[PDB]
């Protein structure tokens, strides 16, 4: 019901609501474009845009059996994904938005009730970037990293265990060895180590220790 589009221009709200009911009536290319655009600019939308993207994807399959919108969306994302490093340089905020959005898409947009394998390596590419020592020193990126691991970390591991394992080695490494990792960064990494080791769930006692 709530797709979280309040950040949008009033005209565009109408465009998006229209696409949900009658995809065929709107420019799905311009619709995917305004969604990716906004997703890189607003944090709440970046973590929630998957809902509306899924609704539209389903609406088009129902109405015309087409997957044009899915296709414009994936290809526009792939382009932002290819330019991830440049975007990170320009704005850490935009970059964490990109990662949150890609990962939200991986969570929401399925393909015959299965995850898109097209996004498995690109998500790991993103999380491995966050696990680097130049990224870990920024609580903003660590926050981003553990958000994705909380939300889709489990699904990701099923697709590829080898990558998850090597990723978490970087997390232990940063944890023990890095010195400009902050207190918050340390609390965030330690919680996620416990979180995975417990089978991607938060224990009652951990809940008490880490969170208000």
């Amino acid at each position: 019901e709530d797709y979280k589009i309040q950040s949008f221009d009033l005209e565009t709200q109408k465009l998006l609501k229209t696409a949900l009911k009658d995809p065929g009536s709107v420019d799905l290319e311009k619709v995917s474009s305004v969604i990716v655009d906004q997703s890189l600019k607003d944090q709440v939308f970046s973590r929630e845009a998957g809902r509306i993207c899924y609704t539209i994807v389903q609406a088009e399959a129902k109405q015309t059996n087409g997957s044009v919108f899915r296709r414009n969306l994936l290809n526009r994302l792939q382009q932002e994904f290819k330019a991830r490093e440049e975007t990170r340089k320009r704005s850490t905020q935009e970059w964490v938005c990109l990662v949150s959005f890609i990962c939200n898409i991986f969570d929401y947009l399925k393909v015959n009730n299965m995850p898109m394998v097209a996004l498995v390596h690109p998500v790991y590419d993103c999380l491995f970037r966050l696990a680097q020592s130049d990224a870990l020193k920024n609580e903003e990126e660590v926050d981003c990293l553990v958000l994705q691991l909380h939300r889709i970390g489990d699904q990701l591991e099923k697709m590829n265990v080898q990558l998850m394992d090597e990723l978490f080695n970087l997390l232990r490494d940063g944890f023990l060895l890095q010195e400009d990792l902050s207190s918050m960064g340390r609390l965030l990494l330690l919680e996620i180590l416990e979180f995975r080791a417990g089978g991607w769930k938060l224990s009652d006692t951990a809940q008490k220790y880490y969170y208000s």
Binding site: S67, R71, L74, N75, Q78, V111, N112, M116, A118
Partner: peptide
């Protein structure tokens, strides 16, 4: 044709390739 840019890695394509393969 093999190696042509139509075959160059494309998320949209990979997903269709998966959807029909499943």
């Amino acid at each position: 044709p093999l190696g042509s840019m139509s075959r160059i890695k494309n998320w949209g394509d990979e997903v269709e390739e998966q959807e029909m393969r499943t």
